[PDB]
């Protein structure tokens, strides 16, 4: 089944967001969580899992809390080896680790947080990368198309959304420090006779809540990388 295209729920307008657009841009910039074949090492609340994933590139985190929509999802992946991929946040992130009074001077642990992004490792690997075409519509016209790549058979929508928006930040300035050249944007995922979409712009007002925005990924929704198609619909600002 297909989510109706926007107009019920009309889209967020970037011109009515008066906060710092950088706080959206940073979620789809170069840095993101990516780990292959890792297992949970702890749990804070009953609907999350904690991973020791080090930020080898900048060391901004050593531990990542992954939050899910419900207990069933955390139970499904607990203690199993998985791949993790997603957009992380810091300012609103908190968790405690249950290391049983720990030792070895745990100290100086650097934390970050995310939602969903988890797929089983075993069985889900392709030998060679798969390409997925993204068609971009600007004011109704398809003026740009490009591909994103994944090595997973079942892939989260979060991973594909990140890769799509990363290209558009770098090449079409989708988000800038204090504005966007686009008024509205949505990303649409098509998988056989199912389709769904996400609003790409922040809610109006002077503050952007990163955690609430990223919470949409807590369903861990997945698509089959061989069947999915991506469309992006942007409208330009006056």
Swiss-Prot record:
Its main location: secreted. It is found in: Secreted. PROSITE patterns: STAPH_STREP_TOXIN_1, STAPH_STREP_TOXIN_2. Pfam families: Stap_Strp_tox_C, Stap_Strp_toxin. The keyword Ubl conjugation does not apply. GO terms for molecular function: metal ion binding; toxin activity. Staphylococcal enterotoxin that activates the host immune system by binding as unprocessed molecules to major histocompatibility (MHC) complex class II and T-cell receptor (TCR) molecules. In turn, this ternary complex activates a large number of T-lymphocytes initiating a systemic release of pro-inflammatory cytokines. Also causes the intoxication staphylococcal food poisoning syndrome. Interacts with MHC class II molecules composed of alpha/HLA-DRA and beta/HLA-DRB1 chains. Interacts with T-cell receptor beta variable 19/TRBV19. This is Enterotoxin type B. The lineage of its organism: Bacteria, Bacillati, Bacillota, Bacilli, Bacillales.
């Amino acid at each position: 089944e297909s989510q109706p295209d926007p107009k019920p729920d009309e889209l967020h307008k970037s011109s009515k967001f008066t906060g710092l657009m950088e706080n959206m841009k940073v979620l789809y910039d170069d840095n993101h969580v990516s780990a292959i074949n890792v297992k949970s090492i702890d749990q804070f609340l009953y609907f999350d899992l904690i991973y020791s994933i080090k930020d080898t590139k900048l060391g901004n985190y050593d531990n990542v809390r992954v939050e899910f929509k419900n207990k069933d999802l955390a139970d499904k992946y607990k203690d199993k080896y998985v791949d993790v991929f997603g957009a992380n946040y810091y300012y609103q992130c908190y968790f405690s680790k249950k290391t049983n009074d720990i030792n070895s001077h745990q100290t100086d642990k650097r934390k970050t947080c995310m939602y969903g992004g988890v797929t089983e490792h075993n069985g889900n690997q392709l030998d060679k990368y798969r390409s997925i075409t993204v068609r971009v519509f600007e004011d109704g016209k398809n003026l740009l198309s490009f591909d994103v790549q994944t090595n997973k058979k079942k892939v989260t929508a979060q991973e594909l959304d990140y890769l799509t928006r990363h290209y558009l930040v770098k090449n079409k300035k989708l988000y800038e420090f204090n504005n966007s050249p686009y008024e509205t944007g949505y990303i649409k995922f098509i998988e056989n006779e199912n389709s769904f979409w996400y609003d790409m712009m922040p809610a109006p007002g002077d503050k952007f809540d990163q955690s609430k925005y990223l919470m949409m990924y807590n369903d861990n929704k997945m698509v089959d990388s061989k069947d999915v198609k991506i469309e992006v619909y942007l409208t330009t600002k006056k």
